[PDB]
Design a protein around this nucleic acid. Structure first.
Lengths: 52, 49, 50, 79, 174, 141
RNA sequence: CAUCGGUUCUGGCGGGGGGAUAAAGGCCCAGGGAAUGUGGCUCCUCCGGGAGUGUUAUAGCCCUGGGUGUAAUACCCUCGCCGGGACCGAGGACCGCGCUCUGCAAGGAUGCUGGCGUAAUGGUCACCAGCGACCCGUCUUGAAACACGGACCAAGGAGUCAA
């Protein structure tokens, strides 16, 4: 009798998708990147980037 | 994908919140809204939805 | 439930894999061309007159 | 001219619909006519375009000529 | 013409049996976004080589940021613009802090002074004047002078447009 | 077509009922020539005679199509390559589907249109990109 | 007024990802360079300041590489949270999908309270006000104009019957 929005009414969200509670609890929208020192930019890349 | 998309009824969006560009019936490259805007379609989807 | 968990994991892995391929190409001194898009969303924004 | 003390009849800028439509149609007919005379026009037209060149007030015009000459010698050596 | 960003766009012809490794072409293009940048790349490449969008690919699009946006610099822009007569050269100079800001000032100045649109202007070179002796336009030479200090006469005070009536006649000396 | 002698492999082509034929009228032979229309048209063989064949054409008149049966000598008919892309394909699907059913692994057996290309990596070494201006500098020379 | 559901406008906050793992920039380290040449020195002087010299001095700047640094921030994308407001309440025992499962925001609004109980709400007519609004038929042609009819009212008045 009434279409309810899953993005607003969380009960319909858990009806359509039971994994929503696990998503919100485990914070899968805030997953940090893998650790490790990032390699620097190669000099040829910057030279081509700033080449006239 | 064909069966899923044909099962999905065509989406009836509302008008964009914030409107269109000043001249809408013109290509997106020229400064309008028609044509392929590539990844910029998402802001239009949030405005129209 | 298990299927949605698998789908979320697959989306995250695809995103990080695209970023990783771009980064390793940049570090090896080349250019990674990403795949052309397979999905488009078409919106009709003009009327039905003339 | 004694315009300031005794002005004349004003020139109206308010155009009429008849005049607007007639001017638009004459403009379109003129465009079609010049396209026809352009297709029938026998005047010679160069395929190449005379390039304007490089401005004298560009301060690095000498370095650009150096670059062009160097690339020409490099292309001649490669060929 | 808007908030512009400079992009390097590198593209090439599609690899065939005759040419497994076709040549790469890189251009520096001022555009509001990457779609316009790629469109301008394909336009300028159609103007020079036997490559179009249907027979070529975009290898890379990268943003070229200014090395020193906090340093006041003099830029010389050599450009060609299309008018009723034809294509004409212009050399102009702008005292800005980035190449993109110089290009926006260029587009505004050509629109204001010669009625030239974005579609009719080709940016051929944007260079940095390393020395002040390379400055040629007197309106930049009066700005690069030694001990440049000037007043600002007749400064209209900024009064809020929603405050209609004031009880004091404003002064123009601050 | 060159003036003079007609090639003689025209007579050595065998036409059967149901074959698809083009109509390319030879100007040298006047016997068996069809109308000014029905030249450059593709049709179906329904009758095979000693020196001529019958071709089914669908002419248009007003707002309808009318079947026409045209008797054309072997001089002016040519085998049509419209259904060779069908016959070669259907044979190829026949043996490929037999082999795939014998092996076990299912395959995609329908022809597919041009899909967007996948991701790949392009090396810069020995293929360093060259910087281009809107106009060529040797041209500005 | 409180607690809700549907739609929607707007504000703030907490995270994540990307790019030159932003670019800058600060603080250090190692080089190089110049003037719109700082200090010093010299020459003029109205001695107020100018002129010449040279690379930091009794100011500083620019270029290149390295460290802090996986720095911050801008921009783009994204995961949530907390407010402020408007319009709406369709259905009428239960069933169903569900959840945080003694119950519930889960197949459409209930709970508490106040005043009044009458022209108070509501309605009709007359008039003012804001906005909108050419005189009806017919004819013409593709249409408009032109032309034609209309002072007003009551009654009568025009696709019927037979074969």
């Amino acid at each position: 009798v009434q279409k309810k929005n899953p993005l607003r009414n969380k009960q319909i969200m858990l009806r359509l998708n039971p994994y929503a509670s696990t998503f919100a609890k485990e914070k899968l929208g805030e997953v940090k990147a893998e650790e490790g020192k990032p390699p620097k930019v190669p000099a040829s890349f910057k030279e081509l980037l700033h080449e006239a | 994908f064909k069966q899923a998309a044909n099962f999905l009824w065509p989406f009836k969006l509302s008008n964009p919140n914030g409107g269109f560009r000043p001249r809408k019936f013109k290509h997106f490259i020229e400064g309008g809204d028609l044509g392929n805007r590539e990844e910029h379609i998402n802001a239009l989807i949030r405005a129209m939805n | 439930f298990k299927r949605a968990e698998k789908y979320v994991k697959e989306y995250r892995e695809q995103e990080r894999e695209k970023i990783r391929l771009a980064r390793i190409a940049k570090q090896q001194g080349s250019f990674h061309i990403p795949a052309e898009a397979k999905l488009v969303f078409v919106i009709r924004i003009k009327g039905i007159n003339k | 001219a004694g315009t300031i003390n005794k002005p004349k009849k004003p020139t109206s800028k308010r155009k009429t619909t008849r005049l607007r439509a007639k001017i638009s149609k004459r403009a379109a007919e003129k465009k079609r006519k010049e396209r026809k005379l352009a297709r029938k026009n026998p005047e010679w037209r160069s395929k190449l375009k005379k390039d304007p060149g490089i401005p004298n007030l560009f301060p690095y015009k000498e370095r650009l000529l150096q670059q062009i000459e160097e690339e020409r010698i490099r292309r001649k050596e490669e060929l | 013409m808007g908030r512009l960003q400079e992009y390097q766009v590198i593209g090439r012809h599609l690899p065939t049996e005759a040419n497994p490794n076709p040549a790469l072409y890189r251009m520096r293009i001022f555009a509001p976004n990457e779609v316009v940048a790629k469109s301008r790349f394909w336009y300028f490449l159609r103007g020079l080589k036997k490559v179009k969008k249907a027979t070529g690919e975009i290898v890379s699009v990268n943003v070229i940021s200014e090395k020193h946006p906090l340093k006041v610099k003099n830029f010389g822009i050599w450009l060609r613009y299309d008018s009723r007569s034809g294509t004409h050269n212009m050399y102009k100079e702008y005292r800005e802090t980035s190449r993109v800001a110089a290009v926006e000032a260029m587009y505004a100045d050509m629109a204001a002074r010669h009625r030239a649109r974005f579609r009719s202007i080709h940016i051929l070179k944007v260079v940095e004047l390393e020395k002040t002796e390379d400055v040629k336009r007197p309106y930049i030479k009066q700005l690069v002078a030694k001990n440049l200090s000037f007043p600002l006469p007749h400064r209209v005070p900024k009064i809020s447009t929603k405050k209609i009536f004031s009880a004091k006649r404003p002064s123009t000396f601050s | 077509r060159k003036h003079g002698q007609i090639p003689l492999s025209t007579y050595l082509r065998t036409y059967r009922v149901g074959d698809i034929v083009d109509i390319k009228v030879n100007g040298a032979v006047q016997k068996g020539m069809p109308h000014k229309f029905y030249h450059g048209k593709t049709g179906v063989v329904y009758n095979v005679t000693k020196s001529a064949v019958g071709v089914i054409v669908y002419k248009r008149v007003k707002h309808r199509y009318i079947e026409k049966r045209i008797n054309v000598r072997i001089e002016h008919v040519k085998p049509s390559r419209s259904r060779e892309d069908f016959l070669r394909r259907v044979k190829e699907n026949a043996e490929l589907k037999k082999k795939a059913k014998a092996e076990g692994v299912p395959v995609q057996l329908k022809r597919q249109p041009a899909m967007p290309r996948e991701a790949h990596t392009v090396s810069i070494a020995d293929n360093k990109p060259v910087t281009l201006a809107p106009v060529a500098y040797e041209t500005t020379i």
